[PDB]
């Protein structure tokens, strides 16, 4: 059985039943059954959101290289007002999140379509709706679940790297990759900063502190700039 540390003993609460189980829990956060049940859904939702976000950022830079993703919320103008879009998103997200939360706390209780009584999701597990949500499932379910959780973890780390690279270099993912490929020995984080007992140098925050959006002055500070190496 593959593990995050070959030759180590996995935790007792991690028996390898859940997909993506590699015996990684040094803090013992998943020891409780209810906590593990909640964290499983949290990881699945985080995985899917990060996967969609990373794919969207890459496609955004490929299709629109002149638009920075970090500035995408500012330099995008639509006939629909920002407050109207926020209201639409709030209502739709509230509806779907309440339905998902109710399915989590009460399994097999919101599988029925409230509009049409002839549509109902078949019995499933928490975090894996299926039915109308899965019109095509090519391959084994367990193998695909492992692939999904692994791709989701990679995408989560990728989004964190996207944010950090955008705050340190001020460029997109493809732009940062090209900049690093041009001079690999002088573009890493080690080449940009270093800390010693006599001096502590950190890279400057390329993101401006304030952003003017229709006369509102939205503050945009780099994530934990003081703790930057």
């Amino acid at each position: 059985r593959p593990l995050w540390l070959p030759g180590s003993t996995p935790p007792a609460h991690l028996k390898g039943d859940l997909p993506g189980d590699f015996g990684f829990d040094p803090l013992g956060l998943g020891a409780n059954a209810e906590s593990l049940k909640w964290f499983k859904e949290s990881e699945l939702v985080h995985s899917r959101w990060a996967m969609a976000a990373v794919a969207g950022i890459l496609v955004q830079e490929i299709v629109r290289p002149d638009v920075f993703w970090y500035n995408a919320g500012k330099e995008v103008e639509s006939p629909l007002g920002p407050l109207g879009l926020l209201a639409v998103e709030f209502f739709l997200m509230h509806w779907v999140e309440v339905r998902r939360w109710q399915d989590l706390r009460k399994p097999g209780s919101v599988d029925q379509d409230p509009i049409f009584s002839q549509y109902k999701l078949p019995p499933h597990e928490v975090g894996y709706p299926g039915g109308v949500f899965a019109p095509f499932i090519p391959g084994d379910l367990a193998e695909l679940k492992v692939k999904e959780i692994k791709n989701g973890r990679l995408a989560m780390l990728a989004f964190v790297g996207f944010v950090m690279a955008a705050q340190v270099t001020g460029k997109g993912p493809i732009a940062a990759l090209q900049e690093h490929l041009a001079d690999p020995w002088g573009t890493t984080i080690f080449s940009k900063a270093a800390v010693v007992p006599g001096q502590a140098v950190a890279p400057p925050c390329k993101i401006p502190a304030s952003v003017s959006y229709k006369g509102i002055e939205i503050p945009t500070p780099c994530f934990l700039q003081g703790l930057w190496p």
């Binding site: 013992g28 956060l29 020891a31 409780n32 906590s35 006599g198 003081g226």
Partner: protein, 213 residues
């Protein structure tokens, strides 16, 4: 058998190693009585947690002050916050005393009568205020991750880590107060001054700690 504070001396009879961070340190026998010892355990836990929060906040603000972020020192942050923002000091004092009074009074009456706050008289909540042990209030509110209701050995290890980190943070807060009273600068400023020249920039050369120096 267990390591004590002063090696070779037997630990006191009222300290049998059951509590977290037990090293038999009680030369004045302050916690000789059982009820007094229980009260002192809760006092030490509260002191350690408050000192841990204070030390972390002081270190973070000093880090932001050392780099060009505009953060103020810990001994001037209160004045800077009250003057920069239109915040009335007595109003903030009253609000904090109200919230702290409610939380501390509930904790106090739970210490006097264990599990008495679980009756549901506070908005219907019952299991969230039952309390696991003295000074260790488990539940879904204080422990949302459930690290105290799973892997008992890990829970005991975390208890030892918490009490030791709290004692270290208390010593750190005392060091912050003494360093500001002697040098007059921030804690990270003292750390940088010491790292620049450790043989001549210390408490033995500040001119305040050793008066005969």
């Amino acid at each position: 058998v267990r390591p004590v504070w002063f090696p070779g001396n037997p630990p006191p009879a009222h300290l049998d190693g059951s509590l977290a961070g037990d090293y038999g340190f009680d030369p004045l026998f302050l916690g000789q009585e059982p009820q007094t010892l229980k009260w002192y355990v809760q006092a030490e836990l509260v002191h350690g947690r408050f000192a841990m929060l204070g030390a972390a906040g002081i270190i973070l603000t000093s880090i932001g002050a050392k780099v060009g972020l505009g953060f103020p020192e810990w001994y001037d942050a209160g004045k800077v916050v009250v003057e920069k923002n239109n915040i009335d000091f007595p109003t903030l004092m009253v609000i904090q005393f109200y919230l702290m009074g409610w939380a501390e009074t509930k904790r106090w009456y739970d210490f006097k009568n264990p599990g008495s706050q679980a009756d549901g008289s506070f908005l219907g909540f019952t299991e969230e205020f039952k309390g696991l042990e003295n000074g260790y209030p488990g539940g879904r509110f204080f422990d949302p991750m459930g690290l105290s209701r799973g892997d008992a050995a890990k829970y005991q290890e975390y208890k030892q880590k918490e009490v030791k980190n709290g004692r270290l943070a208390m010593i750190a807060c005392l060091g912050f107060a003494a360093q500001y009273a002697a040098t007059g600068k921030g804690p990270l400023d003292n750390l940088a001054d010491h790292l620049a020249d450790p043989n001549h920039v210390n408490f033995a050369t500040n001119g305040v700690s050793i008066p005969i120096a």
